[PDB]
Each structure stands twice: as C-alpha cells, then as structure tokens.
Paper text:
The P2X7 receptor, an extracellular ATP-gated ion channel predominantly expressed in immune cells of the blood and the brain, is an emerging target for treating refractory pain. Here we identified and mapped the binding site for the P2X7 specific inhibitors for the first time using X-ray crystallography, and demonstrated by electrophysiological experiments that those inhibitors allosterically abrogate conformational changes associated with P2X7 receptor activation.
To confirm that allosterically-bound P2X7 inhibitors prevent the turret from narrowing upon ATP-binding, we obtained the crystal structure of the P2X7 receptor in the presence of both ATP and A804598. Consistent with the activation mechanisms proposed for P2X3 and P2X4, ATP-binding brings the dorsal fin domain towards the head domain and pushes the left flipper domain away from the ATP-binding pocket. These movements are coupled with widening of the lower body domain, though to an extent in which the transmembrane helices remain closed. In contrast, little conformational change was observed for the upper body domain including the turret and the drug-binding pockets, supporting that the turret closure is essential for P2X7 channel opening. Altogether, our data suggest that P2X7 receptors undergo unique conformational rearrangements where both the drug-binding pocket and the turret in the P2X7 receptor narrow upon ATP-binding.
Author numbering:
A (entry chain A), B (entry chain A), C (entry chain A): 34 to 207, 214 to 283, 288 to 350
C-alpha cells in the first residue's frame, strides 16, 4: 500500500504530469560569417582552366528560407549557353550509331534537350543525338576532388532564436566566441567543422558532393515556480543519406544579353543546407492535471491494498 | 462486468493507448526532373510575337524553401522597362476624361505608378493618367489560353524525406519508376499529372492561371515490438481555392544596363507551388500509460458490476 | 458529494475534455500590395549622390518562403565591385601603422578580404591593410536617418490561409478593406502601420535598421455539433530584439559583365521579415475521452463522500 503510493509519487514527479505541457513557437534568424578564397585550376571542355578569386558572404549563401539556410561548398560553371541545336554530351544512352539511330521529337529524362532525330558528330567521329536546347550542353563531370570552398568549415554562423508560447504569454531570446560542447556551450556562433565533428562526418569529403545538415534544439522547460529550468539544448544530426543523386546540388542560371543575343549561364551548385529545428516542451502546473493523476492513482492504491 | 472488461481491452487495443505517442521531425529534399519546350505565338502590345525555345530544369523551378517547391506553368514577359513618366495602361479606373481629371501625387493600389496629375494620351485620343514608374507599364492581359508549359504535367519530381524522433533515437530515410496508387506505391518519383488525377483537378486548366498543390504524408507508426508498422502513407489534396487573384503568380524582375542606361525586365509568373507536409505519430509502449489506462478502466468495471 | 460532481462537470465543460484535440495543418499564400517612391540624396564614398525613382512590387519583396515573406525598408548600394587588390575600409582593426603592421594571408571576420601583408594608403596618408577581394570594399556606413522606403507602412498585404485536419476530413479557406481590431476584423488585407501599431513599435524607427515581425493566428475551434465555433483569431507580436547586428539585413549581389570584365554589385539590404504562424486546436467529441474523464472523476467523488 505505502510502496504503491511512494512509487506513484516518484513516477509522477519523474514524468512531471502535474505541469501542463505545451509546444513552442519559434522564429529563427541566421547570419553567415566568414569568407573563402578559391585558387584552383581544373580543365573544362577539354581545355585546362584556372580559377582564382575570393567569395564574399553574399556569394556563397542565400537568405534564410523556412528556418533553414544553404551554404555552397563546390560548383561547376558553364558559360555561354544559348538556345539552339547541338549534339548531346556523350553518355551511355546519348551516343547514336547511325543517323536514324535516335528518335525524333524525343527527350530523355537525364538529357536536357529534345532530340530532333539527327545523328551528329560531337567530336572526332563520335556521334550523339542532335538535341534542341541550351547549347552547348553542360558536360557530365564529377565534382572536383578538392572542394573549391575549402575554407567553408572555418566559417562561423550566428543563430538567433526567439521562443513564444501562447499559454505562457512570454518571449525568450537566445562577445565573439565559438560554441563548444563543454567549454563554451552558450556561444551562439558555430564553426561548421565543429558541427561535422559533432556528427562525425568529414567536412572535406562531404563538401565535394554536397550535403544536408540540420541543427536540432531541444527545450526541457518547466513553468513551475519551484524548479524553473529553461535552457536551450543543442543537438546535432546529419540529415543527408551519406551512402548515396546524393548530397545537395541544383542548377542555377544567370541570363545576360551579349551582342544583341540572348544568353544564359548554367551553374551546377553543390553545397550543404542547414535546417534549424526547434522542439520544446512547456509545463505550467495545473490543478486539473494533478487532480486527474491523483484520481487515477487512487484506484491503483486501493487495488494494491485489496491484493 | 465481463463485457465491460472485454470492451475496455478492445477499445484500448483499437486506440493503442499503451504505446507512447510523439510527433515526427522531418527534413525534405526535392529534385525536379523533366524539361518542356514552348513554341507558341501570342500578340504583345498590339503586335504579334512568336515565342520558341526549351526551358531547362533551372529555368522553371527554384530551390526548395520551407519544405516546398514551386514550378512555373505560364508567364507574361515585359521587356525594356525603365524608370520614367508614361501614361498608365487603360483600365476602368485609369482613364482620364480631362487634364485635371486625375489627382496629382496619387497612386492607386492596382496601379503600379504614382500619378503626376496630367491627363495624357496612351494611343489615339485615349487618355489615361500620367504616371511615374517603370515605363512602359505592363499591359493588363489574361493568362494565355494554352498554358505555355504544356509539358509540365509529364514532369517527374523526386522527394526524399528523412524522419527523426527524439525519444526513438533513430532516423528513417524514405530504379526509375512513377508512383502509382496501387501498382507502384513505393516509387518516390511522382508525375504531376498523376497528382492532379489523384485530386481530380485538370492540370491543363490550372496551369493557365496557376495553383498551389501540396503533398501530404501520414505516418501511422508504432514502436511496439509485436506489431511494428512504419510505412509512409501518401495522400494528396489541393490547397488552392479553385473557385477564385486566384492561382499562384508573382512579379519577378531582372535588371540589366543597356547603352549606359539602367533597365529592368518585369515578368509575371504563374505556376503551381507544392507544399510537402509531413505528419506522423510515434508509439513506444510505456508502463505508466498502461497503468493509467487500467486505473481508469477499473472504476468503470466496478461501476458496471454495481449497476 | 454533490458539489464535487457539479465542480467536476463545470471543470470538464470549461476545459472541453470530451472533445478530441488535434493540431491544424495550414498552407499560406501571401501577395504584397502597394508601391513606394524614393527621392532622397545621400553622400556615398565622399561624394554627394541623389537617388530618385519608384519601386514596383517585385522590387521590394520576394516570393513566400517557409510561410513567411520579407519586405525591404532601407538599403545601401555599392556599384562597380570587381575582384582585385585594394586597401580595406578604415576601421578600428583595419588601419595599419607600418608596412609590416598587418599579417600576410590573414582575413579578419568583420573584414571581407584576405590581407596580403602590405600596408597601403586608402586616402591621404591613412594606411590600411592591403586586401584581396571585391574592390573597392563597401564602406562601413550606418543606415540612412530617413528610411528610404518611407511609404512601406502604407502598403497592404493579402494573406490567404488554407486549413486542413486529418481527422476532420475538411479544408477551410480564410472587397478592398483594411483589417481593424474592432471595426473590421474580417478583412484579410493588413496595413503594416496597423500591425506595428498593434505591437506598439514605431515603423519609421524600425525601417532604418530593419526588423523581423510575425503574424500569429490562433484557432479555438471545436467540432462539437452543439457549440460549433471556428473563427481565425489574429494576434500580433514582434520577434525582433528591439534593444539590439540587430534588425534584418543581408548582402545581395547582382553580377554583370562590362567591357569584357567580370563585375559585381553588392547591396546591403535592411528590411522587415514577416513570419506567418498558424496554431490551432481541433475538438471532435469522442466517447472514449468522456468515458475516461468520468472514470477519473468517479474516484474523486467517492473519496469526497468518504471524507
Ligand atoms: C582553417 O583554419 C586553420 C587554422 O585555425 C588552418 O590551419 C592552418 O593552415 C595553414 C595552411 O593554409 C598551415 O600553414 C597552418 O599550419 C595551419 N594551422 C593549423 C593550426 O591548422 C586551415 O588551413 C584553415 N582551413 C582553410 C580551408 O582555410
Ligand atoms: C506527355 O506524354 C504523352 C505520352 O506519354 C504525350 O502524348 C502524345 O502526344 C503526341 C503529341 O505531342 C501524340 O502524337 C501521341 O499520340 C500522344 N501519345 C499518348 C500515348 O498520349 C503528351 O503529348 C505529352 N504532353 C506534353 C505536354 O508534352
Ligand atoms: C501614408 O498615407 C498618409 C495618408 O493616408 C499620408 O499622409 C499625408 O502625407 C502628406 C505628405 O506626403 C500630407 O500632405 C498629408 O496631410 C497627410 N495626410 C494624412 C491624413 O496623414 C502619408 O504621408 C503616407 N506616408 C507615406 C510614407 O507615403
Ligand atoms: C549567388 C550565387 N553565387 C555566385 N557566386 C559566384 C561569384 C563569382 C563567380 C562565380 N563562379 C562560379 C560560381 C559562382 C560564382 N554566382 C551566381 N549566380 C549562388 C550562391 C549559392 C548557390 C547558388 C547561387
Ligand atoms: C529563373 C526564372 N526563369 C526564367 N526562365 C526563362 C528563360 C528564358 C526566357 C524566359 N522568358 C520569359 C520567362 C522566363 C524565361 N527567367 C527569369 N528570370 C524564374 C522561374 C520561375 C519563377 C520565376 C522566375
Ligand atoms: C529584387 C531586389 N530589389 C532590387 N530593387 C532595386 C531596383 C532598382 C534600383 C535599386 N537600387 C538599390 C537597391 C535596390 C534597387 N534590386 C536588386 N537586386 C531585392 C529586394 C529585396 C531584398 C533584396 C533584393
């Protein structure tokens, strides 16, 4: 009888059933900090090309969208594209053996053009299907072995989170320093390399193909006057698949007119997209809850006494 | 007495009250696949114009923002706009009868310019209020009868969802094939026409004015060791109003300098915006929950025996 | 005994425990309305400059991302930037006393360039560290005293919210008029000045540095056939910090080629970002819930009779 009561009180205190539970409504704002300089040479379209320059903050990041920001880590540039007819890039399914090899008015899913039914020569007696689209088509090329945005990990991000709860009627807002698991857990500025070290994923390896990382924030807050604890817990987990179109990459174009001719530049962007997740639990003691718990435990105690 | 107990156990098993319930934290990544070629001629500004060309993946879509992507289906192009003074486009409230007809320093909500108080001639003794803004103003014109992006329905979208739960400490990640309601429900690649066929909304009709469609995912997962079921359920529903500024459309500009003169191109974009929604329910059996349910049913059984 | 029963029924009716509770899944679409004309003169780079013109809808706003839109209120323009070497802008940590004062191959966090280790003269015997990046670097300059987008408050925004619930199997969709707290609470068109008047924050003061505002919507809906109440409640709260890199601002660039030379224009954007939040509570009466509540109150009544 007494043991059932002590265990009921201990379980109720451990689960905190007397305090009312409610979700948290958060609004996040992020500011990217740090710049990187790319000075690597990679051949393009059969010709060796040298790339050099520095990327400002606005060059490698977008504004926060849906409580999540993106950061570039690698890219493939294609300049001078203009609508027209050209032979498709050589692929396992793009090479044509004869003129009538390909089908007219057909567009493959992987191909970025609609075939006109003509077998043309891309380079030196190598025939692919004549396609109608942005010419020339971007070459199928793996991400560069060294991630162009090598200095991306040394970057530091600033995350400001505003918490609001309807029942509480309060809003909680979350020196230059880098967040550390134990030394400095309060610093809201994070080093990407520190995050990937938290998740155990190589930043240099992921930056080549791209990735999707998210920052999880847990709130174990209780509105009780006695034990008032409300501190943001920072947990990190990788959303990308790892094993592996893996990583994060999309086609982004910039259109310009040259010599009275419409032109477009297609850029394949590989990067890491961070999703800021805010999950919290609020608990403001309510008399009805305590009365319900007591009412439920009373029967258990009585049955324990009956045996 | 016995019937009340059997009904209590049957109801508890049907509602699954013994298993702990928790929400699901998801992160979605989408990749658009497919291209369309537009070769339609539509008159513009009183002159017949011919439009032809193919649109790549980067041309008709944006990067995923807020777990939702947008896909263009129709557009109205306006080129050569530059700041200055010009007569407003003829409308029910823009035509001026006399010079002093319009008010100086006034800007109507529907109008995109601030009137200077001068009644000018747009074309052939037709007078509208002189306005200061991007000139010339884009003409009020209905969406083209045939949706320019006819081939949009044949497109295929790839959706990858990563599920994470705090109490479970696990992450679940969700061949070229098209998803089917019964034949192939596992294929994560979707044909837009298949979605609109699921919702029963004509794609060709909606593409003209634009629309907002969302993909709902339901999770009826249970963490119990006995019955372990965790499969993503795909439900589809149209968020747009249908009846009807209906549809989805926004003004998107691209600024270029020509002949040492600042210029801007205004494009009215009509398209369908897909919102990926992830709703799930987790249930990991907890002793406290079962004890609470039993404690609540005990009183009901006793009262049933008392009668 | 009787008082405990009457109080139990009154408390159950007040808390509405018999009705099933469920969250709400919303999809929001926003359309910005109104235009502003900027005709202010502010000196730039030691030279007085005059700015004049009108901004269309597409100029000061982006498409809705993550159920939240952004509206510009102030900006700093920097034109002609091109990659190269140049002296950094004079700052407390950028001025070099001697040639060997600065460290080679070092980039400060606040600085947007990587120092080459050379002490150069920015203007008249004033030495800063030679940096490699976008040249010339944007000058450190406070936001203009008068917010360039003065007419932003007079703007009107249209918000359309679609509500969906899985258990209810229904979708609820939410004349030109401005929403008022009491006169016209149904008008879905909002005047920004009206919002900031609701939150008590000066719009003219915030527009200079920028801000983050959110529109909260509460749903106290009950699916009971007797008392069927389901009306959207509009509550407003400011997410920005106020006290204070405060406000909302980001670097946004536009790249153009001039005289066969790659060039970029960096624009520091200050604005207010509105986050549309949808929180609701659904309640469809369930027999199991009522039976549970009654079972929990029965023990309390019996104990009250025992005394
Ligand atoms: C990130 O910062 C670290 C220093 O905190 C850099 O490490 C140095 O790298 C240089 C070569 O660039 C070496 O000469 C130094 O010996 C390194 N020092 C340390 C302590 O590691 C690192 O190179 C930076 N990474 C990037 C991509 O810029
Ligand atoms: C989408 O694909 C279907 C085929 O799966 C196309 O249907 C064909 O259309 C052509 C005309 O372009 C007809 O000659 C064929 O007879 C059609 N076949 C079938 C099976 O429908 C359809 O035209 C495509 N739609 C778009 C907009 O490209
Ligand atoms: C917003 O609209 C109000 C009117 O509703 C404007 O107020 C007028 O401002 C002009 C000067 O531009 C004065 O001559 C009038 O006397 C004002 N009238 C009233 C009733 O206030 C206000 O200027 C507008 N604000 C902006 C930034 O355009
Ligand atoms: C804003 C844009 N950044 C861009 N940065 C470059 C600046 C100079 C030269 C470049 N060359 C190749 C590639 C990039 C650049 N260029 C564009 N557009 C971007 C960033 C992240 C993801 C997509 C797009
Ligand atoms: C990225 C952009 N796509 C664009 N595609 C075109 C490419 C060539 C010619 C065009 N002509 C008219 C209209 C479009 C185009 N042009 C721009 N900007 C876009 C896509 C979807 C929604 C808004 C904006
Ligand atoms: C789309 C863009 N608006 C822009 N509007 C201008 C139009 C003409 C002259 C300008 N001069 C200075 C500054 C702006 C402008 N220009 C660009 N890019 C924008 C809007 C809001 C936030 C970021 C970016």
């Amino acid at each position: 009888h007494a043991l059932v009561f002590s265990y009921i009180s201990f379980a109720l205190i451990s689960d905190k059933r007397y305090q009312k539970k409610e979700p948290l409504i958060s609004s996040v704002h992020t500011k990217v900090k740090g710049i990187a300089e790319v000075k690597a040479e990679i051949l393009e379209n059969g010709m060796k090309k040298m790339v050099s320059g520095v990327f400002d903050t606005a060059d490698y990041t977008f504004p926060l969208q849906g409580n999540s920001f993106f950061v570039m880590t690698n890219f493939i540039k294609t300049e001078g594209q203009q609508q027209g007819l050209c032979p498709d890039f050589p692929t396992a399914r793009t090479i044509c053996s004869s003129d009538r090899g390909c089908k007219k008015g057909r567009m493959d899913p992987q191909s970025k053009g609609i075939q006109t039914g003509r077998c043309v020569v891309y380079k030196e007696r190598l025939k692919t299907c004549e396609v109608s689209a942005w010419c020339p088509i971007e070459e199928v090329k793996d991400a560069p072995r060294p991630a162009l945005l090598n200095s991306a990990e040394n970057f530091t991000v600033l995350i400001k989170n505003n918490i609001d709860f309807p029942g509480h009627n309060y809003t909680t807002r979350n020196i230059t320093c880098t967040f550390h698991k134990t030394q400095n857990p309060q610093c809201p500025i994070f080093r990407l390399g520190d995050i990937f070290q938290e998740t155990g994923d190589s930043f240099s390896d992921v930056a080549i193909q791209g990735g999707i990382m998210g920052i999880e924030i847990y709130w174990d807050c209780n509105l009780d006057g006695w034990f008032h604890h409300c501190r943001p817990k920072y947990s990190f987990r990788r959303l990308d698949d790892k094993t592996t179109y893996p990583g994060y990459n999309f086609r982004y174009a910039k259109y310009y007119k040259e010599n009275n001719v419409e032109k477009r530049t297609l850029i394949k962007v590989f990067g890491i997209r961070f999703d800021i997740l805010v999950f919290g639990t609020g608990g403001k003691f309510n008399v009805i809850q305590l009365a319900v718990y007591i009412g439920s435990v009373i029967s258990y105690f009585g049955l324990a006494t009956v045996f």
